Amino acid sequence: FNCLGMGNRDFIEGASGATWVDLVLEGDSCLTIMANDKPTLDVRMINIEASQLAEVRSYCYHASVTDISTVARCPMTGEAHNEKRADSSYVCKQGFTDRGWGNGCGLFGKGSIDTCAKFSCTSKAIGRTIQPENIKYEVGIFVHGTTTSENHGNYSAQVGASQAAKFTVTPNAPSITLKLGDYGEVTLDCEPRSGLNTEAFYVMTVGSKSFLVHREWFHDLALPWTPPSSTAWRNRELLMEFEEAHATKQSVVALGSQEGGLHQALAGAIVVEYSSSVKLTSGHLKCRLKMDKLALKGTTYGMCTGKFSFAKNPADTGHGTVVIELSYSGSDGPCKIPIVSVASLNDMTPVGRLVTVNPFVATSSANSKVLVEMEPPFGDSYIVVGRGDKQINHHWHKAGSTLGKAFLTTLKGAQRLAALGDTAWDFGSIGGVFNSIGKAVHQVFGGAFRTLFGGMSWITQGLMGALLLWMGVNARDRSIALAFLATGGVLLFLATNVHA
């Protein structure tokens, strides 16, 4: 629900100018909003939920042969007919048995037989189709107040402080307004139906576990399949075989369990669990964060008059910021916690910015732990907690200097452009003009081009790109980039994006 210790933690730089913002989020990633008058926010997906799922069809991967029956007939008799062709449970096939005068017939060289075997399915997979309204999204939202190592990673604890909230956005109710208490209220307007594509794929159950598969590939699977209701199947002859015909003897043999082949047929499928409601891991949702009633209280506070202490030692979040936990032994609380991030000790001018804005002591109780995060600048810096001689400080250094960070925005920005489709420009939030046409140019470019030849797998589009790079070598003036258009970017990039 919060951004604490998440695998992917990305931030948001507030330019103010508007109280509303359109952001896209994910299950693994946690967005962090920092703005003026608005405290630090956490926005992430818990999982993707779906309420009602219809049964599209099923697939029998594992079968067994039962009741082999072959009716032998003489040559020149034409078709052979076994009485088992009436029931659909019996799998019947034409054929022949080369006849002499020794076996069953008075003619030579030819024959006719009808081989029937009752079909028995040992194991079958089942698919699911997703309805748009049934899709639910549990979106953890959190605002950073006074926190500890316990309550901050705790939900119900911050609900008592009204600093964390959960909710379910559906196409029936895409808009939800939740109050943060002392910090005001925020309005979240999401797009549940359009976050994913509900009809783009199915949910296939292989064995006990269920998995995601494209629905156009779902019907293109070659394997005996099943209608929703009960009985009559199609292509059930594929799991069984035939042999030579000696007199009346022909053995219908069944293929083994194809479950492994189904697991082999699954490559990019996402593992999905379930109990009452299916929980999808990687989220895609378009929400609107309205901060209008979110504000800062306590404008009249002052600094804390007493000693600090470290409840836990400082470390690096790996996302570019440094978090600390402080146990304040002073009894003068509630008080605004003095703290900064400075370049040198002789220079009291704050440089680094606090990730958690306005650190505050909850209650007058001494030794109360408080967890506050800050973003120091690049190079050698210092974490200074408090003013006057009772401040206790710490030295920090961060090698991520904007040279490499410019590429971390650039390179990941193109990675943000990839795999997000046309929604990639939603990071262009509070947009228009550029950001609007930047998505619009890529809109039809996303509705054509890459999606037209899309479906290429790994080196398929990657290898030919190197051959399409040769198209840029042979060309004419003003015709150079014409053969080079789709080559560089959008093609080799995603090939370099996923290596492996």
Partner: protein, 74 residues
């Protein structure tokens, strides 16, 4: 059949560990390399066809490296 025409790749959202990811790089190459090692005598005359026609140098390899990949599993 289930052997070919795999689900891979989804390529919708999906930043996660999929069912088979690291093994996706070993799909074609290794099985096609096991084919060209299976048939070395072909590989000798294979790349010969590239130097036969067109006299355009560097694009003659474009024939070979592409055509040597054609023969495995057709």
């Amino acid at each position: 059949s289930v052997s070919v025409q795999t689900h891979g790749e989804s390529s919708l959202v999906n930043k996660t560990e999929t069912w088979l990811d690291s093994t996706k790089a070993t799909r074609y190459l290794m099985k096609t390399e096991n084919w060209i090692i299976r048939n070395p005598g072909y590989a000798f005359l294979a790349a010969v066809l590239g130097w036969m026609l067109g006299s355009n140098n560097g694009q003659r390899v474009v024939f070979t490296i592409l055509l040597l990949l054609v023969a495995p599993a057709y």
